[PDB]
Amino acid sequence: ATKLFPKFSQGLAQDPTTRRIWYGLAMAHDFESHDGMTEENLYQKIFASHFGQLSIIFLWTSGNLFHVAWQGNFEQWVTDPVHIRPIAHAIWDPHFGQPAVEAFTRGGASGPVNISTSGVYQWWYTIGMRTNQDLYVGSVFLALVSAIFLFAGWLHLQPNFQPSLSWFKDAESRLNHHLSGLFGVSSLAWTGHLVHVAIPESRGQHVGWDNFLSVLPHPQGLTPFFTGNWAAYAQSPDTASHVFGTAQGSGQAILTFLGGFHPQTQSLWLTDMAHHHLAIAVIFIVAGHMYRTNFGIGHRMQAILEAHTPPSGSLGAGHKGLFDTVNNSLHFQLGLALASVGTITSLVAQHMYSLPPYAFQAIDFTTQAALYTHHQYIAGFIMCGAFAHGAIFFIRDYDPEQNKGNVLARMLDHKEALISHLSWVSLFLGFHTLGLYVHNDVMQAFGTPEKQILIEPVFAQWIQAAHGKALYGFDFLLSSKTSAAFANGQSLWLPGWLDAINNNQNSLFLTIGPGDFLVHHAIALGLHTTTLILVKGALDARGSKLMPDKKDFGYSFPCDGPGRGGTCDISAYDAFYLAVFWMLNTIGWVTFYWHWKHLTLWQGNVAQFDESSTYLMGWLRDYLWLNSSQLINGYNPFGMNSLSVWAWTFLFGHLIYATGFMFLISWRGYWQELIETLVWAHEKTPLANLVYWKDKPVALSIVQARLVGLAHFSVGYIFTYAAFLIASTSGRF
């Protein structure tokens, strides 16, 4: 009979097989495919889901704060943040034997704990947290915020509180409020916290809710701000002998732009960060008054889009009708948001390792490596999702009649040229990068290392020289002492920036050579190939020569059968599917390069990387084989240490990856026949045929098989690299 689950799909509820549960779980968030769904109901469900997501995020943050305040060593880590390892949380496992108990008992705790690698200790220490009471109060506050967000999500679904469809389409009002309030006012408030709490707490002065109304952030007290003498806030900054957390060497300035890093914490100045947030707050608030909402002044995005067509007709109709195809399509907005968020996540990773913002973050090698790898993998997944949603937009929301002659239609008009050129770039990069690598490998194998091709990256070195690095000797722009660009910043920020960039002990514009050139080309190959697969799948989503009516089958369908030569993996979903492997490979190459260069930097031997990164054998032996010795020795027949959990996780990831290869290689048919034999065996077995199944056992579908195999592949990939990176970086240092 018809089952209750899933309530959103009547066709799935009538399915008498096990496929009903799987499809009900995988199509729960596809509100557009639900039964009796309207546009207004769609937007309302997304609103409630957004509130629930915020509730989960805030609860997770409160949980991290609570566990650090309860089972951590934050009160002891602030005293000696160079020789004390941060504690994530305690370990309570009845499966642990005695050696595992004393092995994980470290960091000054009274029992087995986990050493945190997220870097929340440095972040909380920099923003002003000093005691466990502060973390406890922050945890309770975030839990209350999470409960409020959850209640808001439940409340916006009840009658008299459901927003209308017209409210969700007010793009001008939403953009104005997000730029001025969500971005500008939030940044201004963060500036207020840095000026009022973080900066005085870094100078040994406690400023909490009990005394912030009686403690002045500056000795002049708002007089220079109102009189326009803003330069008075940059007078007397922290000297080079300032000790973080104490008043020794501290200054009085609150808004500076010294640049560079703090001599002790090796991080950005707090006054510089406060000034940064103040400037971007003013800029975002000003930008929040651009669109017309209810007072006559402002813009209409439709007018700006319609008045942006070239006169010669190079772009056809230009952007006519682009306002309606974006405002009425949620997949277009989701794709744009994911593309920007993925790029910003990558930007965060690069800027965070190169310019550490939190105190004593550069010394924590495990934290730096884990944070960079985490943000780069998150960025790669988000980028793949952006392109997948672009393909979904082409299939479900693109209207050729409304987008007639504009840039959107012209993209599909010459999609063959785009795919062909992406293919050519990827082919050239792959052929040459692989050829140079194999050539260097043959030269190193034959005992002639002077015969390998080592192309110097003169363009990137030229840019590094433009930033102030005098190692290469170009002597121009910031590298030349007689340039206008150099002389115009010598009194504001160039001294600190130049001192930091010319220091070879940090990660600020590291020295590069032929190995960096080759790996950068490998990165370019990965980016271009992943882009080729994603772009080709989005452009061919509506159809191709093999499947002229692909848009009539949806975004995800198994195939079109073995006819016409065979149509396996013809849908756009399959294109995203194949692109996830390339994304994992690209992020693997970038994280491998980052980890090896930083490992050789921290070990004090950059020549090892410079001489072994030019051939793949050096990558396999000097980086993968050499750095995994301590990892695989976490547990051996002679005993175990605290690093055994990473060894177990290493083997765990290998097992999950290999398990994924099963769903990836073997296909449905074999499993369906095997399941039929199992059905017969259960039906003909006494004492067991009395227990019957409620859902008919069937093999996983083709699409489900691909998703399951990719999920196992990605999980094994991530867990294996995370275990190796954390174990190698923590054991070495």
Partner 1 sequence: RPMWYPGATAPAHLDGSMLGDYGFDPLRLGVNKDNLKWFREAELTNGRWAMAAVVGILFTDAVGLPKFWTAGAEKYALDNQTLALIEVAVFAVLEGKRYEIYKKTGETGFLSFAPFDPMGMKSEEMKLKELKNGRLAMLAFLGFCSQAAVYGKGPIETLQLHLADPGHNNIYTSSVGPETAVTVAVLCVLPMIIEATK
Partner 2 sequence: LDPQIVISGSTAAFLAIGRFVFLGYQRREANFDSNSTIFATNDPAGFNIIDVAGWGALGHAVGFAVLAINSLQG
Partner 3 sequence: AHIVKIYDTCIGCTQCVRACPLDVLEMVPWDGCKASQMASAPRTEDCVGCKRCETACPTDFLSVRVYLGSESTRSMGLSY
Q: How far apart are CA 414 and CA 272, in angstroms?
A: 48
Stretch that binds partner 2, among 288-296, 390-398, 401-409, 687-695 (CB under 8 A): 288-296
Residue 450 binding: pick among partner 1, partner 3, partner 2, none (C-beta 5-8 Å cut-off by kind): none
Contacts to partner 1 from residues 111-170, by CB under 8 A: 140, 144, 151, 155, 158-161
Q: Does 568 appear as a known binding residue?
A: yes
Q: Does 559 appear as a known binding residue?
A: yes
Q: DSSP class of residue 540?
A: S
How many residues touch partner 1 (CB under 8 A)? Answer: 8
Q: Min. distance of Cβ 629 from partner 3 in angstroms?
A: 52
Stretch that binds partner 3, among 10-18, 140-148, 244-252, 647-655 (CB under 8 A): 10-18
Figure out which of the listed residues 156, 169, 177, 292 binds partner 2, where binding follows CB under 8 A: 292
Figure out which of the listed residues 26, 303, 438, 568 binds partner 2, where binding follows CB under 8 A: 303
Interface with partner 2, residue 638, by CB under 8 A: no
Which residue lies nearer to partner 1 by CB, 151 or 428?
151
Which residue lies nearer to partner 3 by CB, 501 or 698?
698
Figure out which of the listed residues 229, 239, 420, 490 binds partner 2, where binding follows CB under 8 A: 229
Judge whether 37 and 31 are in contact, CB under 8 Å. yes
Place of tokens 């406890």: 136
Which residue lies nearer to partner 2 by CB, 298 or 435?
298
Figure out which of the listed residues 60, 151, 230, 428 binds partner 2, where binding follows CB under 8 A: 230
Residue 97 binding: pick among partner 2, partner 3, partner 1, none (C-beta 5-8 Å cut-off by kind): none
The token duo for 52 is 């629930």
Q: Min. distance of Cβ 663 from partner 3 in angstroms?
A: 20
Q: How far apart are CA 494 and CA 581, in angstroms?
A: 43
Q: Min. distance of Cβ 690 from partner 3 in angstroms?
A: 17
Element (H, E) at 295: none
Measured over the CA atoms of residue 591, residue 592, residue 594 and residue 599, the dihedral's sign is positive
φ, ψ of residue 128 in degrees (nearest 5): 125, -5
Place of tokens 């990605």: 714
Which residue lies nearer to partner 1 by CB, 162 or 235?
162
Q: How far apart are CA 632 and CA 625, in angstroms?
A: 10
Figure out which of the listed residues 94, 97, 221, 296 binds partner 2, where binding follows CB under 8 A: 296
Q: Min. distance of Cβ 64 from partner 1 in angstroms?
A: 20
Q: What DSSP assignment string belongs to 506-532? A: SSTT----HHHHHHHHHHHHHHHHHHH
Figure out which of the listed residues 299, 520, 654, 668 binds partner 2, where binding follows CB under 8 A: 299
All residues at 6 or more sequence positions from 659 whose CB lies less than 8 Å from its CB, including other chains: 712, 716
Q: How far apart are CA 531 and CA 576, in angstroms?
A: 10
All residues at 6 or more sequence positions from 289 whose CB lies less than 8 Å from its CB, including other chains: 176, 180, 298
Figure out which of the listed residues 6, 19, 73, 530 binds partner 3, where binding follows CB under 8 A: 19
Stretch that binds partner 2, among 137-145, 289-297, 329-337, 715-723 (CB under 8 A): 289-297
Figure out which of the listed residues 1, 4, 213, 231 binds partner 2, where binding follows CB under 8 A: 231
Q: 87 forms bridges with which residues in the sheet?
A: 115
On the question of a cis peptide bond just before residue 514, with omega within 30 degrees of 0, the verdict is: no
Q: Measuring CA to CA, which residue among 238, 232, 245, 222 is closest to residue 271?
A: 238
How many residues touch partner 3 (CB under 8 A)? Answer: 24
Residue 548 binding: pick among partner 1, partner 3, partner 2, none (C-beta 5-8 Å cut-off by kind): partner 3
Q: Measuring CA to CA, which residue among 690, 204, 616, 206 is closest to residue 441?
A: 616
What does the per-residue mask of binding to partner 3 show for 525-564, with x meaning CB under 8 A?
A: -----------------------xx--xx---xx-xxxxx
Q: Does 671 appear as a known binding residue?
A: yes
Place of tokens 């409304």: 402
Q: How far apart are CA 240 and CA 12, in angstroms?
A: 68
Q: Min. distance of Cβ 372 from partner 2 in angstroms?
A: 37
Contacts to partner 3 from residues 653-682, by CB under 8 A: 676, 679-680
Judge whether 499 and 264 are in contact, CB under 8 Å. no
Print burial letters for 699-725: b (CB count within 10 Å at least 16), e (below 16): bbebbbbbbbbbebbbbbbbbbbbbbb
Residue 14 binding: pick among partner 3, partner 1, partner 2, none (C-beta 5-8 Å cut-off by kind): partner 3
Q: Min. distance of Cβ 4 from partner 1 in angstroms?
A: 13
Q: Min. distance of Cβ 3 from partner 1 in angstroms?
A: 17
φ, ψ of residue 48 in degrees (nearest 5): -65, -40
The whole-angstrom distance between residue 65's C-alpha and the CA centroid of its chain comes to: 21
Which residue lies nearer to partner 1 by CB, 140 or 165?
140
Figure out which of the listed residues 56, 140, 144, 286 binds partner 2, where binding follows CB under 8 A: 286
Q: How many CB atoms lie within 10 A of CB 287?
A: 15
All residues at 6 or more sequence positions from 392 whose CB lies less than 8 Å from its CB, including other chains: 331, 335, 541, 555, 572
All residues at 6 or more sequence positions from 24 whose CB lies less than 8 Å from its CB, including other chains: 5, 6, 9, 12
Residues making contact with partner 1 (CB under 8 A) = 140, 144, 151, 155, 158-161
Residues that bind partner 3 (CB under 8 A): 11-12, 14-17, 19, 548-549, 552-553, 557-558, 560-564, 676, 679-680, 683, 696, 698
Question: Which residues are documented as binding site for phylloquinone?
Answer: 671
Which residues of the shown chain bind partner 2 in the complex (CB under 8 A)?
Answer: 224, 226-232, 286, 289, 292, 294-300, 303, 491
